[PDB]
Antibody, heavy 214, light 218 residues
Framework: EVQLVQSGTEVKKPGESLKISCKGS????????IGWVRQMPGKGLEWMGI????????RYSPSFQGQVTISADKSINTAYLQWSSLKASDTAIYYC????????????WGQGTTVTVSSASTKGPSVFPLAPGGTAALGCLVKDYFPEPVTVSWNSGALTSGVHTFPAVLQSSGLYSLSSVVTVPSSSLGTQTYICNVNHKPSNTKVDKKVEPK | DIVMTQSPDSLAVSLGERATINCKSS????????????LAWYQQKPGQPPKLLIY???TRESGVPDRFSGSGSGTDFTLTISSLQAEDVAVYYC?????????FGQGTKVEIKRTVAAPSVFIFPPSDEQLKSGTASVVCLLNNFYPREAKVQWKVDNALQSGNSQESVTEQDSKDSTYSLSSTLTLSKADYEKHKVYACEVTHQGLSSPVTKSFNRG
């Protein structure tokens, strides 16, 4: 059995250096050549480089030739990918994958690491209500938070039917915001209570918002 | 470098019908000696690392069902699915492990075709707790519609607004195979109380005339 685990997600400012650890375990990791691949938030996949512990890290992409340095430490079987200096475009998810030889497909993958570069500070969100043919819409607007992500559930999780939580959108100020919505029959609009439980772990904030029309 | 282009940017097919994806190469990925091509296919679903689905253009992996069959050789390759099921909605890539550096494909999202559905449009005025903060944000919501391609336009006193609203769409709903859209118009308090009426205008192929739903301030 072959596995690959990556380090925790990272938040930084443009300028510093950082590194991702990709550790391998299982029967016969020795033969596996590890490649790195980036997935920018909106776009798709793109191959950065490949390296074999034991150092034949010869292969890079021309697009990523001058940007980053990769490496490996055979002793602990991990493998790293390095950055001299970050920019705002470096915010992406990064995976390490394994193939058994030079010209082989990447059969086994890692969990992936999210990196965020912003020059912005961590701040707790602000929640606001979204109150109104028997299809009354409700919602919560979670505004101006950083960094990602937040977890929003409804009514303590009891209610699930018709709930939509949109992906975050990075705004002008460099902070995120998203909205959750649920449609309910008009007949329940005073009788039943609606509370959205947003959770933002980086700011350690837990907010419950009761939405009501008037 | 060898560049690969997948044929359909967006591809929508009904349930149980076959789908077709193709890849093309400026060079050849076939080593004549062993007659084996060096092209793989991966699948990835939203919020999860990509999983390999085919190696050498025809060989599957341990978890890959017999419904997925690779094909082609040389410079045209085809990923064919015999019967599209609900769990197979994902984005597929094709890469080459022939000559380094290695390259991935553009991407091919697979929707589930369904009878065209009209959005349930709702309009939300900004909260009073947000006005005390200093900025107002009007929200326009589109609920349960197909296809995904729809567009909304903001009007303040029927003055066209642009570049001030940011959009956000959901993934294809697994149960009813539909989407939802939220457009957030962020504005300042002083400018919000300078005008009277606020309107969001929706256009979609599922509606004969553009639907506009709007609120008057107060």
């Amino acid at each position: 059995e072959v596995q690959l685990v990556q380090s925790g997600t990272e938040v930084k400012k443009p300028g510093e250096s950082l590194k991702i650890s990709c550790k391998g375990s299982g029967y016969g990791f020795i033969t596996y050549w590890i490649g790195w691949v980036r997935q920018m938030p909106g776009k798709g996949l793109e191959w950065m480089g490949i390296i074999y512990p034991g150092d034949s890290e010869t292969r890079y992409s021309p697009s990523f030739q001058g940007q980053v340095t990769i490496s490996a430490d055979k002793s602990i079987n991990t493998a790293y990918l390095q950055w001299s200096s970050l920019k705002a475009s470096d915010t992406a998810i990064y995976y390490c994958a394994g193939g058994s030889g030079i010209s082989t497909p990447m059969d086994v993958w890692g969990q992936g690491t999210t990196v965020t570069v912003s020059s912005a500070s961590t701040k707790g969100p602000s929640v606001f209500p979204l109150a109104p043919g028997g299809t009354a819409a409700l919602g919560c607007l979670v505004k101006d938070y950083f960094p990602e992500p937040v977890t929003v559930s409804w009514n303590s999780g009891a209610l699930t039917s018709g709930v939509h939580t949109f992906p975050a959108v990075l705004q002008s100020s460099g902070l995120y915001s998203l909205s959750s919505v649920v449609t309910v029959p008009s007949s329940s609009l005073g009788t039943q209570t609606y509370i959205c439980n947003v959770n933002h772990k980086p700011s350690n904030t837990k907010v419950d918002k009761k939405v009501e029309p008037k | 470098d060898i560049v690969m282009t997948q044929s359909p940017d967006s591809l929508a097919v009904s349930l149980g019908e076959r789908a077709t994806i193709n890849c093309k190469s400026s060079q050849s990925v076939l080593y004549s000696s062993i007659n084996k091509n060096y092209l793989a296919w991966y699948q990835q679903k939203p919020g999860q690392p990509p999983k390999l689905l085919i190696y050498w253009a025809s060989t599957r992996e341990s978890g890959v069902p017999d419904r997925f069959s690779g094909s082609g050789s040389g410079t045209d390759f085809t990923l064919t699915i015999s019967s599209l099921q609900a769990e197979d909605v994902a984005v597929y890539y094709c890469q080459q492990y022939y000559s380094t550096p290695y390259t991935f494909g553009q991407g091919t999202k697979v929707e589930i075709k369904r009878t065209v559905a009209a959005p349930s449009v709702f309009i939300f005025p900004p909260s009073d707790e947000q006005l005390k903060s200093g900025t107002a944000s009007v929200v326009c919501l589109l609920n349960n519609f197909y296809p995904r391609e729809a567009k909304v336009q903001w009007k303040v006193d029927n003055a066209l607004q642009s570049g001030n609203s940011q959009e956000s769409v959901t993934e294809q709903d697994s149960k009813d195979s539909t989407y939802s859209l939220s457009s957030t118009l962020t504005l300042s308090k002083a400018d919000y109380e300078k005008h009277k009426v606020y309107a969001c205008e929706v256009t979609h192929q599922g509606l004969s005339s553009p639907v506009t739903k709007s609120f008057n301030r107060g």
